[PDB]
Structures are given as C-alpha cells and as structure tokens.
C-alpha cells in the first residue's frame, strides 16, 4: 500500500519530510524552495515553475508559448502562503484519488520504486556515480542566517506549480551535455509543472449514442486523470524508456494545415486508445529494440559495477539488487545478470501499453477526449476540488449520490454548472491564423490554429520495410501488439517491487552541470492571404454580430460576407423563405412550430434524391455547408459524390509512403535437411510479417492524414448546424419582440423548448453525419490506400516465389523425397494475399465498428459499376477502371446500351489490377439487365445452334464469359489449364406470351467456393458445381462485343452492368432487382418507358390471348383471340402481339407543364386510338347502373354524358410492366368511377344465346387492387406494346 503524507504549508522545516530543496534547474546558482514529501521519493514544491521563463512572460501578452493550447495566464497564482497551502492539500486529495484503485496505486508504486540508476552514459561501467543532477538533489540543512550546509537526497519526482501558462501541464526530464538519462535506460529525477483547477475541456462530437440526453455539450477533465497522464510520462522517464524515434510531424505547407510541434510515439503511447496506431509497426519495433539495447547496457553495467566514487556509504550489492528488480533482470547461480526476454517484453508492454490515459479513464470511470488529436475547447476553473459536494476521492465529479455517475454527467458542462466557471477571455491567448480574402482593408477571418486540418508529413513514416532480411533456420518474427490486458496488470503479484527502497540520503551534489531549456513567446496571430473559400470561410459566413436587429437567411455566400444582416444557410431555398417570412400576430405561434419543425426535417435529410444510385449513406447538404474539398458547394453534391466518392471532400490528397519490400537472403545449411525446411517455413512466416507491417504502415498514414481531415469535417458540421440553429432562434426572438405587448400575451412561446427541440434535431443530424463521414473515411482507406500497398506486396510475393523456388532447386539433393511437397507448400501459401484486418492494428472499438459497418454494406463490395453520365459510360465504383466505348455502341440516358454486329460496336474495360487477386477460391458476382431480340422466323436454326459471346474477360486463355445461344444465356468459367465450367438459363420459345423474349430482365451470376449460379429477376434459376476446376485468372480486360457467327441484324441491349467482389445472397439480389426496377415513369410491354403520342397495341395480363377490336356495326370494343404462329416449325410458337387497335396516350392537360413525353403514375390522360384515318377515344357512360359496362369508343367530343378522363395507375408494388386505367369524374375530384378491363356480357336473345367478352369498365376490380400480394392476373392489368425492332411476327 502507498501512504500519502499529510502536512500544511506553514509546518516547520524538519529536514526530513519538509525540506528546503535546491532543484535541478536552479543550477546551484542562488535559490531554494520549501519542498514537501508527498510519498517516498516524490516531492511537491507549491510554487511557480520559473525555470527558463522570464517574469514578464507570466502576464497575458500579444504572444503565446505553444500553438495549440488555449493559454490561461495569472501571474498571481501561488503568491501567498495560503494559496500554497491549498495547492498542497489539493495534491494530497488528488494523490488520494489516484491510489483509491489498484491500477492507480500500482502506478504510484512503480514510480516510487523505479529509482534512477546511479549514473548515466558518461559514467564508467565499473562505477556508480551519484554526483550528477539526474540522480541527487540537495537539501539545505543549515538554519536560517547560517553558513550553508547541504546534504543530498535521492528523488524520483518533483512536482511544481504551473509555469506562465497554468493549464499547460508538462513533465520534463534532465538533459546533461546534450543527452538524457531518462531516454537511455538509466532514468533520472523527473520534474512536473502542474495545476489542478484549470482543467481542459473537450467534447465528443464524433461519437454517437453517446448520451441518453445531454451530449454533446462539452466536458471538463478530472484533474486526477490529468495528473495520472503526466505520471505516466514520469513512469517512462524513471525506467529510462522515454526514447526518441521517428516522430509525427505535421505537413505545414498549405494555409489550412495545422501547425504543431513534432509528436513522439511516447506521447501517443501515453494517451493510448487509437493513437498508438499512428505509430507504425516499423517504428514500434524500432523503439522496442532501442529500449532493449539500453537495458543490455544496464545489465552489463550491473555485471561490472564495483565501486561508488561519490558516496562511500552506498552498498554496491544492495543497489545491484534493487536495479535487478527494477529492470526485471534474472541472476544465475554465479551471480551473473542477464535479460530474460519474456520478463522484459511483459515489463515493456505494461509500461507503454498498460498504463495509458485511455485505460485509466476507463478503469476510473472518468470521461476524456477520444484522441491526442481531438479538438479542444477553452479551459475552465474548478471552483473547489476540496468540497466533497463537488469532487471526491472515490468518484471525482461523477458522484452517484448527486446522480452524476451515469454518463459522466458530473463532467458535463451543461449539467454540472455549479462545479466550474468560464475564464474571462481577457486572460486567454490562442494562436490564430488570420485568413484574408484575395482573388486571382478587406475581409479577414480569424481561425484558431487548432481548428485547422492536421495532416502528417510524409517524413512522419518509417521506410524500414525496404530493408533486406536474413532468413536462417532459427529466424523469428517480431510483432509488438499495442495492447495490455488491464485486469491482469491489476492482478500481477510480480509487478510491484518487494525490495525495500534504500535510504534516500546521500552526499551533496557538487556537479551542477545541467541543460536548462529556455522558453520564449511568439506572436499569437499569423496573417495570410488566400483565394480559397473552404470550411473556415463557409462557417464564418454563418455568423452575425450581436447588435443586429433583423437578420435574414440567404443562400448567397457572397451576400452573407458583405451584409451584416444576411446569414448564409445551406438548407433548401425554401426553408430559407419560411425562415424569412413575416407573419401577423395570430399566425406567429403556428409559424414558429412550422419553422422549428422544417429545421429538424432539413437537418435530418439522409437519403439520395435518385434511388438507383448505389449510395447507402449520404447527408446532401454537407457540400453547401462547408464548401470543403473540391468545391463541394458548387453543383449538386450528391451528383459529385456519385462520380468521385469520399475523395471530393478532402482538402488535401496525401502522397503515400509505400516502400518496395526488401529482398530475403535465405541462409544455406549444407547437409542439414531439418534446417533447410525451417528456413523455408521461416521465410513464409516473415512474408506475413511484411504484409502485416505494410498494412500497419497504411493504417498509420490513413489515421494521421485522412481520418483527421474527416474529423475536422465532423466538427465543422457540428458548428454549422449550431449556427443555423442560433440564427433561427435570433430570427424568432426578434420577430416575437416586434409585436405589441398585448399581442405578445396571446402568443404562447417557450424559448427553452424551441431551443431543446432544435438541439435534438442537430444531434439526430450529427449521428447521420458521423456515419456518413466515417464511412467515407474507411472508403478512402480501402479504395485509395490499401490497394496501392497490395500492388507492391504482390511484387514482393512474386520475387519471394522465384527466390524460394530457386532455393528449393539448389538444395534438392538434401530434400531427398520432399522437394515437391515444399514446392507446393510455397506455391500454395504465396498464391493468396493476406487479408487486411483493421483489428490487428487497433482495439479502439470505434474504428473497429466503422470498419465492420463498411464490410457488411454490400454496396461497398462493388468493384465495377458502369453508368452513363455523359455520353459515355464510366465506372462509378471508386476503383477507377478505364472504360472505352467505341463508336458503334449506341448509348442513351436511360442507361441502356446496344451492342450490334459492327466491328466498332464494342466496349473495353481495363480493370484495376490491385483488387482482383482472389482467384482459386472464387467469390464474386456479376449483375446486369439484358434485352435479347426474338428469333427471326426464317433464320431459326442459326438462332438455335449458333453461340455468340457478348462479354468476355480472358487473360491467357483463362477467365470468364457470358455468351448467348438463341434462347439460352450462358456463364462460363475457364481455368488456367483450359478446364471448363458452365451454368445457363434458357427461356421457352413455344410460349403464347413470353416474359423474357425481347423484354428487359435482370441477370445475376454468383460464384463461390463450390457453386456458380444464375438468378433471373431475383429468383435462383440454376447452378453448377465448380469445385473441380483450378485457378481462374479474372483480371483480363472485359470486352463487351458480339462475337460469334451471327446475322448483320443481330444485336443486344444491356443496362446497369456491375461486378461485386463477393457472392451476393438471394436477399441482396432480390433487393437490387427491386431497386433497379423502380421508376417515376410507367413502362411499356418491353420494359422501356411509356410515352405520350406513341402508337401502342394493348395487352391484358388477365387475358393474355385476347385483344381489342372495334366491333363492326358498333361503337364498342369486342375482344378477340390472338392469332398463333402459323407455320411449319416445331421448335417455336407464340401469339401475335401487333394486333387489335392502334392506341395512343394523350395528355389531358399539359399544365402546369412538363416538358417531356414520359407517362407517369397518377397522370391524367385520354386513351385514344386510330380509326378510319381519324383519332377516336375511349369513354365510359357516366350513369351505368350495373357493376360492369361496355366502354364507348367514338370520335373526340366533350359530351356531358360520358367521362373521358383516365388516371393511369400502378397498384402493384413489386416490379411489373402492367399498369391500370381508372376513370375519374374529373381531374379535381377524389371520386373513383371504375377500372378499364374485360368482362363477358350476355348477347340476346331469340337467335342463339351466348356470353361474349368486351372492353369494359368494372367496379369489381377496385375492390381487389389494394389487396396484397397484388393479383398480377386481374383483368384490369394492361400493358402497351409498341412496334420494336426486336420483335418481328
């Protein structure tokens, strides 16, 4: 157990627990500080840290010390004895809080017991030397007024009060002659400057759900956690493992890049959580190895140390044993110390990955920021940490007794208001960038440096991957996982030293040599000019001065910059008008409701105006709100995102470090088979290490150059929504207060309710924004980063293949009967890429979830997606396949394309070579729509027997093809040996009415480990076992082109061709079918859009073989029976489609207007037809008294005894080409008269009798249309058949 000593500032000096210390940077020059021993080896000097600072710099000035920190100055802090006492007692309270749980007690125990080595790098191996400033500190033990008499004490930590910037706590190590014992294995006296009441503030914008009610309102930090974070640094310093290696350095070469000090891995390790993943495996190992060598230095010193030159009372064997314990060395029977590589590895991992801020916060139930890189809000002052109503040893602020344990409510700025005060911004200094508008005294926006985008410089990352490797029989693989089981830390009964501390008393320090760092302020503002109007500018435009009276919203960014009363908004044109609408007294409460509501709807937009697009998550107003990236506010953002994806949001596209992996040199073992096989096995194991290290390298870059940009975009959206809210609130308040005092009494309005309604809608919007942006980020990783690494990893593999194969062949003599087992070990192993798993490189559950969400969104499996977007097909997948459409290919804007019989009627897709690699175990699907013409009646055997290819993906006589043979559609896989597999779908050609011949249908072929399958229109049609073939090379060019022996007249139409890098499930396919079947417009029989002013024959789904004919003597439609195919052939049969009357759909109105000739559901039409060189029309009698009645077909007239108005309906919700025709009173009324269909009617009477079918209206149909599933066979289901080149009869 750790004991905290108690004392008061004014207690007498006892030369034991209360001393006058001469601290390391005081330099033996001058002056001494009353110091208090809080626990063994740890001291508190409750006074300002002055070392390296000038007195003036303790005042707020026009400059700042660091460029991130919002800096608070108070030169009076700690200027009285009583203040100094409060400091002491707060530290005692904080220490008590820290030791209130094992994890924290153990932190302190490790720190207490981790005494610095009695020397440093300058000291002979055979000597301990205590007379250095990193080891001994002096206490002045003479009385006041007397000649100075000093004795030395060993110490581990000295904690000071703050320097000039109260809220910038800092742990500092002692450099002597330009080297640091605490970075070279020895450790040394550690120093801290700390302030307990001026705490950091942070928010959690970036996480969802989050908080049952009051997120995301800002949180203040528990100074116990701030303290422990710094104590972690002390821990690393005392064990001498606080080493330098390659840091993270920000790129600073554009105006929008955040400028900051270099970041050592040790800082990211200290914070923990996701931040260690920014340190690459390469550098993790580099640091590990440095610390190991450093410890090899100490163990050797320990085997050699003989004397202490500076303190004869030191007992060599006592200290040798304490250091053995500190460093976890082992001792043999001869008393020789060595490194046990396991005890080292455990000690290391526990010190760097066990004790982290992230882990302590989790264990202590303290909330903290999500990352070293998170935004900050300005610091706040904790009124009284000594008040157990506010802050307690056991629970910090989050006191369950005050209902503050749940959700860290006790840290929430919006709930625990009585715990903190804001600091007057007169005392705060912040580094800002003043961005003044230029174009290719003006408008100048002040932006905090830390609000800018953090982008790591390419020099941030290790290229060790490029080094060669030496593969021996005993070669091992190195993985430093950045993780430590926190519960086992807590229960490791070997972790904490059982060796007593030696006496702290020693001889006086007489060598004061030490480097004291010197600090200076720099200007708080940097003025720059820029032509750019990105996030900071777009945000600024959404603000407005306090003293104004009558703000209005605008969509004109420029107007917003010019005029003080105009505030920019990214909501609809239309929100904006409602926002600006001035109403009378009585209508005001209603309007306040509408607009607060409209706001919430606007903020919640999360879908994509076009529904076929293949985007899961989007929030469409992000472009308009920030203009971040590539002019995202100009043009339709949704459209821009469809074309170019997550990239369009990035302000900077970083250049990746992707080293060429170094070659392997395989060692030789003349005469040892066992060592040859082990060298092979070791080579393959090492290959996995290089793959993994490379992925780890991509992840480090992703998180510190891309995911940071996206984070900044999340924060921006939080502010933008909040500005829009604030604006509307001001608009409402202003308009309310214009009203007469009486009018205002009869107007019921709650500003706290309005405020909390909007505040909710923003949190809903930010959940969607988080999901979208997170998705964008993973997308950039997976599409623009990982594949470029995989390209080089495959090179590496292919070089290693050659290498290992040559080696097996050179040593074949010693592989007596094993050479072909080993050839196939190597070939099989290096045939498949190592798959990328983000959980190997982090255990931040946020990131892992991001990544799992992505991988289970089927649309992210699309590796080819050809769509039309400008005359032209292009690949929307995100993998940038090259697409060449040649002149003989007909393209329309319904996404259709026609491959004909011409040489120039072809499309060439050149696939991205870095994502199809997956090749022995197939796992991919292909989907598209096709329209294949009817056979030609006279050329029937060529149809039946001649196979032609339509899409062909072959490289070296291996790959896949879709071919057609008459009424059959065929998928073929061809392996590297030419072994073949097939699956096909054949539609009937002897059917009265075919659902497939010359009509768009949807095909999906899926390939997995054991099956190739064809789906048609969502349904599984057939299937072929494909286990028995080998490797299929699926990365050739895809060539869309008719290739066989076919007529000039032969052609094919396709749309929506796409390829997925996984086997689609039935659900997936059925979804895609439904999705791709959807249209605002109705369709004709063939599946093309239904059109006005276009000749159509009529077909009835309920009476397939029936067609309408104007009765001879009469003005009614009789039903007849379609003629059959009338010819010799036994291979085919069908019913004629081009018969009955030639109908045409006319617009009732064209008004308002529009502007194109496509027919849409709910349109109002006249159904006309041609007769005797005239246009006639289909009416119904107004007053028919039965449930069904003959329709009336007669020339055009407005007779008030017949309805002519027809509304065109599609009652079926599943995909269909049938539509219905409903007769209405007129365009205005809701009264429904009946539906056009076919009914039988009684023919009189004295002659012979019978029933006979007629074109009719019926009320009965209307009673079934809302039933589900919709009956496809009802007689009111019509389809329109225009003449088509794909059908000849």
């Amino acid at each position: 157990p750790v004991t905290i000593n108690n004392f008061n500032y004014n207690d007498p000096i006892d030369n034991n627990n209360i001393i006058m210390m001469e601290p390391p940077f005081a330099r033996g020059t001058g002056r001494y500080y009353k110091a208090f021993k809080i626990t063994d080896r740890i001291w508190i000097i409750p006074e300002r840290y002055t070392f390296g600072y000038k007195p003036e710099d303790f005042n707020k000035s026009s400059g700042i010390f660091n460029r991130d920190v919002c800096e608070y100055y108070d030169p009076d802090y700690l200027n009285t004895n009583d203040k100094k006492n409060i400091f002491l007692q707060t530290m005692i309270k904080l220490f008590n809080r820290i030791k209130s749980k094992p994890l924290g007690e153990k932190l302190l125990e490790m720190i207490i017991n981790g005494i610095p080595y009695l020397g440093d790098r300058r000291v002979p191996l055979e000597e301990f030397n205590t007379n250095i400033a990193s080891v001994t500190v002096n206490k002045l033990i003479s009385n006041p007024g007397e000649v100075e008499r000093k004795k030395g004490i060993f110490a581990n930590l000295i904690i000071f009060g703050p320097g000039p910037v109260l809220n910038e706590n800092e742990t500092i190590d002692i450099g002597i002659q330009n080297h640091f014992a605490s970075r070279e294995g020895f450790g040394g006296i550690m120093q801290m400057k700390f302030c307990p009441e001026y705490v950091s503030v942070f928010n959690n914008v970036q996480e969802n759900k989050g908080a049952s009610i009051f997120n995301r309102r800002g949180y203040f930090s528990d100074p116990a956690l701030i303290l422990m974070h710094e104590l972690i640094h002390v821990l690393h310093g005392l064990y001498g493992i606080k080493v330098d290696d390659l840091p993270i350095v920000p790129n600073e070469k554009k105006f929008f890049m955040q400028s900051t000090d270099a970041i050592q891995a040790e800082e990211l390790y200290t914070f923990g959580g996701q931040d260690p993943s920014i340190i690459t495996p390469s550098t993790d190992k580099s640091i590990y190895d440095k610390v190991l060598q450093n410890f090899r230095g100490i163990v050797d010193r320990l085997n050699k140390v003989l004397v202490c030159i500076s303190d004869p009372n030191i007992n060599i064997n006592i200290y040798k044993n304490k250091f053995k314990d500190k460093y976890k060395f082992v001792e043999d029977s001869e008393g020789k110390y060595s490194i046990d590589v396991e005890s080292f590895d455990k000690l290391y991992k526990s010190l760097m990955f066990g004790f982290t801020e992230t882990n302590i916060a989790e264990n202590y139930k303290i909330k903290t920021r999500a990352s070293y890189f998170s935004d900050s809000l300005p610091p706040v002052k904790i009124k009284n940490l000594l008040d157990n109503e506010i802050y307690t040893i056991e629970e910090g602020f989050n006191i369950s007794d005050k209902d503050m344990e749940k959700e860290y409510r006790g840290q929430n700025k919006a709930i625990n208001k009585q715990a903190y005060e804001e600091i007057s911004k007169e005392h705060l200094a912040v580094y800002k960038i003043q961005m003044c508008k230029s174009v290719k005294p003006g408008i100048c926006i002040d932006v905090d440096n830390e609000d800018l985008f953090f982008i790591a410089d390419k020099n941030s990352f290790s290229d060790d991957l490029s080094k060669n490797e030496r593969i021996e029989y005993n070669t091992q693989s190195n993985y430093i996982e950045n993780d430590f089981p926190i519960n086992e830390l807590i229960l490791d009964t070997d972790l904490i030293s059982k060796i007593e501390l030696p006496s702290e008393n020693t001889e006086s320090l007489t060598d004061f040599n030490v480097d004291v760092p010197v600090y200076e302020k720099q200007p708080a503002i940097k003025k720059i000019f820029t032509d750019e109007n990105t996030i900071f500018q777009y945000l600024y435009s959404q603000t407005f001065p306090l003293d104004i009276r009558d703000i209005s919203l605008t969509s004109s960014f420029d107007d917003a910059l010019l005029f003080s009363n105009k505030v920019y908004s990214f909501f609809s044109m239309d929100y904006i008008k409602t926002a600006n609408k001035v109403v009378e007294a009585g209508l005001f409460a209603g309007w306040v409701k509408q607009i607060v509501n409209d706001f919430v709807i606007e903020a919640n937009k999360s879908n994509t105006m076009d529904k076929i697009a293949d985007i899961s998550l989007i929030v469409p107003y992000i472009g308009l709100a920030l203009n971040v990236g590539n002019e995202t506010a100009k043009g339709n953002f949704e459209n821009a995102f469809e074309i170019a994806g997550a990239s369009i949001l990035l302000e900077f596209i970083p250049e990746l470090l992707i080293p060429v992996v170094g070659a392997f040199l395989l060692e030789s073992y003349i005469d040892n088979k066992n060592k040859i096989i082990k060298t092979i096995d070791n080579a393959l194991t090492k290959r996995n290490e290089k793959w993994s290290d490379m992925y780890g390298l991509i992840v480090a870059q992703w998180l510190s150059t891309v995911n940071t940009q996206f984070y900044t975009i999340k924060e921006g959206m939080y502010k933008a929504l909040n500005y829009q809210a604030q604006a509307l609130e001001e608009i409402i308040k202003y308009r309310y207060n214009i009203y007469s005092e009486k009018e205002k009494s009869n107007i019921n309005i709650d500003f706290n309710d309005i405020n909390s309604k909007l505040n909710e809608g923003i949190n809903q919007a930010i959940d969607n924004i988080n999901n979208f942006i997170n998705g964008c980020s993973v997308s950039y990783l997976m599409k623009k980063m990982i594949p470029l690494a995989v390209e080089k990893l495959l090179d590496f593999d292919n070089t290693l293949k050659k290498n290992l194969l040559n080696y097996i062949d050179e040593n074949k003599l010693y592989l007596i009967g094993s050479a072909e087992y080993e050839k196939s070990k190597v070939n099989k192993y290096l045939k498949t890429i190592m798959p990328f798993d983000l959980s190997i490189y982090t255990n931040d559950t946020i990131l892992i979830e991001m990544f799992n969400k992505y991988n289970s969104e089927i649309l992210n499996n699309i590796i080819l997606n050809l769509r039309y977007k400008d005359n032209n097909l292009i690949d929307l997948s995100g993998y940038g396949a090259k697409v060449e459409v040649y002149d003989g290919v007909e393209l329309n804007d319904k996404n259709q394309f026609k491959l004909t019989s011409s040489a120039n009627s072809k499309i060439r897709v050149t696939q991205n070579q870095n994502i199809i690699f997956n090749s022995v175990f197939l796992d991919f699907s292909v989907s598209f729509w096709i329209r294949i013409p009817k056979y030609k009646n006279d050329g029937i055997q060529n149809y039946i027997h001649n196979e032609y290819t339509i899409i062909n993906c072959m490289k070296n006589n291996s790959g896949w093809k879709i071919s057609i043979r008459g009424n059959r559609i065929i998928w073929t896989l061809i392996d590297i040996n030419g072994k073949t597999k097939s699956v096909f779908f054949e539609y009937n050609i002897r059917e009265d009415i075919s659902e497939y011949i010359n009509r768009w249908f949807f095909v999906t072929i899926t390939n997995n480990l054991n099956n190739a399958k064809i789906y048609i229109n969502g349904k599984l049609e057939s299937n072929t076992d494909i286990k028995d073939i080998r490797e299929v090379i699926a990365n050739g060019e895809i060539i869309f082109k008719l290739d066989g022996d076919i007529d000039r007249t032969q052609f094919i139409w396709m749309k929506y061709f796409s390829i997925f890098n996984t086997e689609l499930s039935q659900s997936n396919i059925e979804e895609r079918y439904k999705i791709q079947s959807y249209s605002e417009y109705l369709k004709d029989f063939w599946g093309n859009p239904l059109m006005y002013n276009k000749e159509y024959y009529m077909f009835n789904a309920g009476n397939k073989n029936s067609y309408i004919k104007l009765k001879k003597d009469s003005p009614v439609g009789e039903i007849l029976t379609r003629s059959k195919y009338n010819q010799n052939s036994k291979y085919i049969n069908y019913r004629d489609l081009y018969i009955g009357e030639k109908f045409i759909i006319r617009r009732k109105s064209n008004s308002q207007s529009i502007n194109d000739d496509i027919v849409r559901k709910e349109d109002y039409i006249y159904l006309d037809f041609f007769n005797l060189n005239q246009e006639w029309r289909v009416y119904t009698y107004k007053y028919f008294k039965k449930e069904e009645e003959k329709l009336f077909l007669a020339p055009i007239s407005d007779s008030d005894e017949f309805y002519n108005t027809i509304q065109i309906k599609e009652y079926d919700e599943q995909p269909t080409y049938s539509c219905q025709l409903l007769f209405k009173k007129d365009e205005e009324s809701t009264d429904e008269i009946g539906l056009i269909g076919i009914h039988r009617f009684y023919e009189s009477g004295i002659v012979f009798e019978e029933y006979k079918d007629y074109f009719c209206i019926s009320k009965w149909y209307l009673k079934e249309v809302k039933r589900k599933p919709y009956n496809l066979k009802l007689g009111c289901n019509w389809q329109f058949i225009p003449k088509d080149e794909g059908w000849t009869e």
Binding site: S1114, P1115, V1116, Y1181, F1184, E1189, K1190, F1192, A1194, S1199
Partner: peptide, 15 residues
C-alpha cells in the same frame, strides 16, 4: 358531328 348516331347505337348495345 355524326356522334349522337354512335351514342344511340351504344345505348342499344348496353340495353
């Protein structure tokens, strides 16, 4: 407009 001609024929068809 010889249409009442048709009307009448229609009315006799339905009756």
């Amino acid at each position: 407009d010889m249409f009442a001609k048709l009307k009448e024929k229609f009315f006799n068809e339905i009756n």
